[PDB]
C-alpha cells in the first residue's frame, strides 16, 4: 500500500538472498548425496532452483516492512500546502 | 450561526442556540446540570436543531492551546457529550456544533454517535 523505493529494493534483496540460500544449500545437499553414495551412471539434472519462484516471494514479503511512517508524510504534505497559491485568485478573469 | 439557521428554516425545525457565553457559564459556576435541562428543552421542541455555537470557548478559557495541565475533557464538554450519547432514540433533535478553534476541539467529540460530520466553512468567493 505505501512502501517507499527502498522497502520495495529490500524485499527484492531479500527475495533474491532467500533463493540464493536454497540453491546453495540444495546443491550442497545433493553433492553429499553423490560422495555418500556414489551413482553409477553421472546424470546432473540441472539447477534444483533454476529462477526466483512465488514461494520465494511470498516468504521475502512477509518481512516486507514500511521505512516511511505516514506522520512524515504528513510533514511534507503540510510542507506542500505551504507553498500554497493563495485561495482567492482561482477565479481570476481579465476585464471584457 | 447563518448556516445553522438557514439549514432549520429549510426544515421548519426550531432552533436552539447555546452560545459560548452559556457554555462559560454553566463551567464557570460549575454548573454543569443544566445542560440536561437544554437537551429536555431541545427534546420538547422536537423536531429541533441544538445549535452550540462557539463550542470551543471552554478550551480556550482553560488556556487556549496550551490549556492546563489537564487534557481535553471538561464538564461543561462532558455533559454535552453525556447527554449527545443518550440523546439518540430522539431522531427529531438535531446537533449542530461550530467552533473557530477545532485544533483545540476535545476529539471525544468527533466519535461516532457524536458530531462526526466536519464541514469546513471557508471565507466567501468572489
Redesign the interface.
Known sequence: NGFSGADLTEICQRACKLAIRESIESEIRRERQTQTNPSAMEVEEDDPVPEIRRDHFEEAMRFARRSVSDNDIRKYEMFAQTLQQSRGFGSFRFPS | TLLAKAIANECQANFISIKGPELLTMWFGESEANVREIFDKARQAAPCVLFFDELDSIAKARGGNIGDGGGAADRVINQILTEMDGMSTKKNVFIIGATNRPDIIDPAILRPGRLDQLIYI??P??
Open positions: 471557508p471565507l468567493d468572489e
